[PDB]
Each structure stands twice: as structure tokens, then as C-alpha cells.
Amino acid sequence: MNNNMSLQDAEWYWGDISREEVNEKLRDTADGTFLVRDASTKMHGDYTLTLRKGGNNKLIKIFHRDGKYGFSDPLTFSSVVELINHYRNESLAQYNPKLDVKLLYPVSKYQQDQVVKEDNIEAVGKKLHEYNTQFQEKSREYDRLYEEYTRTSQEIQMKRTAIEAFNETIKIFEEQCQTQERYSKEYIEKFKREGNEKEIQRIMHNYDKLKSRISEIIDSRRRLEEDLKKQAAEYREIDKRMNSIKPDLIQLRKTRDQYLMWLTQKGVRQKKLNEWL
């Protein structure tokens, strides 16, 4: 049954797709995941088997000579389907003992048939229009949240440095209390016995003014502390909203791409695809 099927009908056979398309189907997939594509025309070989191993994509060339296929001399397989089905049951250690695994999970080109079983072209196209509109909408919703996010992050930066600049100011104005304390200790002493209260009247006036000025500054950074706590909170909230859109975005993109694939594998005009999108 299996060995007699055409390579053309093989689920793991994708034909003329590029190495970059292969990468996007193999990203974050378990070891044993595989697919076959045509080899690049400027090279020896006919097909490239690609499989997951230790988190990497391994490329193995399939060569042909006189009706036989294989990875190296000698070529012993009668067809590519025969070759692949052999290594779905046997470990690749038989070929190379360093890459010890089996071809376990095929990337089927009848993948989208599971998600979309809708047989009508126009029904699939119209659902492509619905999934695309949803995706574009959420993309722009996420985009605005990112603008908000970055702006919020930048304004928090300004406030944090302003807090440190307030603290520095308070230090200077507090050291100014130290200097006035160390300077007046003997100058109030001289006129405590001389009874000159008129001078004390304007020295204490200056000192009270200094204390009065500190209050405002401490209060101003106290107000900035509250603003910052409020804006940091906004930041975390924007971040929460973004983390909810992300999963929905990937799913909406994945569904659109698979619905685009179904119409492509049915060969719908490149112009009618753009009227839906």
C-alpha cells in the first residue's frame, strides 16, 4: 500500500518550496519531525530531507543514479517513498551513528484539511477575509499598546532621574542647615550675653525660610513619587494587555496562513487573493 504510492501524493513531500519555508515549519518542533523538498537546482542531488535533532534542523541530500536513491554510495532504495518509510521504522544510526533517531512526525501537506474541511473555494476565501480582518484589527490594537508602552517607559525614565535630582537637592539644602548650624553656634552665643534679640530676629527668620524651602522640595519629590507609582502601574497594565493580545495574534496569523495555503494549493488567482486580503 504505502511503498506503491507516488512521491507526488506523499504527505511529507512539498516539492519546490524554499529552505526558509522549511525552517518555518520546523521551528520549535519535537525531534523526529520531518519533510522533503526539491534540492536547489544549482547543486547535485534531487531532494533534501530535513529533520529535527537536538533542537536543530538536519539536512540530508537524497541522490539518484540509474533508478536508485540514497544518501551516499551505494544507492540501494527503489524510490524516495521506499527510502523515507524505511527510516520511519529504522533509526538513522544505520546511516550515521551520530544522528540516532527515526523519522517520526511528518509535516503533512494535508495539514490545513484538519482545520479547514470546507470544500468550497469562495467559503474558504470569505473566511480568509474574516480571519484577516480580525488579524489586522488585533495587530493595530497591539500596535497602539506598544506606542503607549514605549512612551510610558520613556516618561518613567525621566521621573526616576528627577527623583534622584530631588534627593540631591535635598542633600544640598540639608547640608545648608549644617553650615548655618555650625556658623551660628558662636554668633548667637556672643549676642545671647549681649542681649541683641533684634539680630536674632532676622537670623532665625533666615533659618525658618530655609526650613520652609526644604518642606516644599521634600513635598515635591513626595508628589513625584506618587506620579511614578501611578505610571509604573500603568506600564504593568499596558504590559498585561499586550500579553493577552499576543497569543490571539499568533493564532489569528496561523489560521490566516493555513487558509491562504489551502487556496494556494488549489491555485486561486494571485489577484483574487489580494481582494480578500
Partner 1 sequence: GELWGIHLMPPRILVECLLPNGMIVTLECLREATLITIKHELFKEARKYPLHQLLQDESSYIFVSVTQEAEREEFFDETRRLCDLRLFQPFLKVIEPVGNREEKILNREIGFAIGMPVCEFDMVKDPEVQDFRRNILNVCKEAVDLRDLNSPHSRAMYVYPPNVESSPELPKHIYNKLDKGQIIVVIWVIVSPNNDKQKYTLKINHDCVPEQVIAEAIRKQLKLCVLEYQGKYILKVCGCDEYFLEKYPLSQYKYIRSCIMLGRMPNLMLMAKESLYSQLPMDCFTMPSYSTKSLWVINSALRIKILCATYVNVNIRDIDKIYVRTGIYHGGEPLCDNVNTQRVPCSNPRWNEWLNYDIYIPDLPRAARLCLSICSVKGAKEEHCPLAWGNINLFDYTDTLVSGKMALNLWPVPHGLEDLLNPIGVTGSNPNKETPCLELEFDWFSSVVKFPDMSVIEEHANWSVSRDNELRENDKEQLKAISTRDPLSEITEQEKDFLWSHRHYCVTIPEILPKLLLSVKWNSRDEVAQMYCLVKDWPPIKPEQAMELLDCNYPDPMVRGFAVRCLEKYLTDDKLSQYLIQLVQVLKYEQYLDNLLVRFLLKKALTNQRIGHFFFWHLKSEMHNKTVSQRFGLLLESYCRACGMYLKHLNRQVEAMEKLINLTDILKQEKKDETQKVQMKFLVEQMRRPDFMDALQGFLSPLNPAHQLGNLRLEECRIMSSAKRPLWLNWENPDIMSELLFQNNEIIFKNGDDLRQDMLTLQIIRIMENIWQNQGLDLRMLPYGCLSIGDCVGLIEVVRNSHTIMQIQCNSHTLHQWLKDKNKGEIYDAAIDLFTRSCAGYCVATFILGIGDRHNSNIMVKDDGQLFHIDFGHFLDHKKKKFGYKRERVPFVLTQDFLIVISKGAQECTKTREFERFQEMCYKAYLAIRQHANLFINLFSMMLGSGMPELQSFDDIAYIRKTLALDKTEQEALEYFMKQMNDAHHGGWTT
Least distance from partner 1 to the Cβ atom of residue 125, Å: 11
C-beta of 6 vs 56, nearer to partner 1: 56
Residues in 59-78 that interact with partner 1 by CB under 8 A = 59-61, 71-72
C-beta of 7 vs 17, nearer to partner 1: 17
The H or E element spanning position 52 is strand 47-53
The H or E element spanning position 188 is helix 187-193
Least distance from partner 1 to the Cβ atom of residue 75, Å: 13
Cα distance between residue 222 and residue 225, in whole Å: 5
Kindly state whether residue 94 participates in binding partner 1, applying the rule CB under 8 A.
no
> For the residues of 204-257, what is the DSSP string, one character each?
HHHHHHHHHHHHHHHHHHHHHHHHHHHHHHHHHHHHHHHHHHHHHHHHHHHHHH
For residue 35, list its beta bridge partners. Answer: 50
Kindly state whether residue 8 participates in binding partner 1, applying the rule CB under 8 A.
no
Kindly state whether residue 173 participates in binding partner 1, applying the rule CB under 8 A.
yes
For residue 36, list its beta bridge partners. Answer: 13, 49
C-beta of 4 vs 179, nearer to partner 1: 179
Among 126, 144, 151, 213, binds partner 1 (CB under 8 A): 213
What is the grid cell recorded at 108?
Answer: 503533512
Kindly state whether residue 172 participates in binding partner 1, applying the rule CB under 8 A.
yes
Cα distance between residue 269 and residue 277, in whole Å: 13
C-beta of 88 vs 253, nearer to partner 1: 253
What sign for the dihedral angle of Cα 160, 165, 169, 175? Answer: positive
Kindly state whether residue 243 participates in binding partner 1, applying the rule CB under 8 A.
yes
Among 226, 250, 265, 272, binds partner 1 (CB under 8 A): 250
Kindly state whether residue 9 participates in binding partner 1, applying the rule CB under 8 A.
no
The stretch among 7-15, 76-84, 117-125, 201-209 that binds partner 1 (CB under 8 A) is 201-209
CA 147-131-245 angle, 5° bins = 35
Residues in 108-137 that interact with partner 1 by CB under 8 A = 128, 132, 135-136
Kindly state whether residue 185 participates in binding partner 1, applying the rule CB under 8 A.
no
Cα distance between residue 189 and residue 179, in whole Å: 16
The stretch among 1-9, 78-86, 189-197, 266-274 that binds partner 1 (CB under 8 A) is 266-274
Residues in 33-62 that interact with partner 1 by CB under 8 A = 40-44, 48, 54-61
Instruction: Report the relative pairing of strands 105-106 and 33-38 from DSSP bridges.
Output: parallel
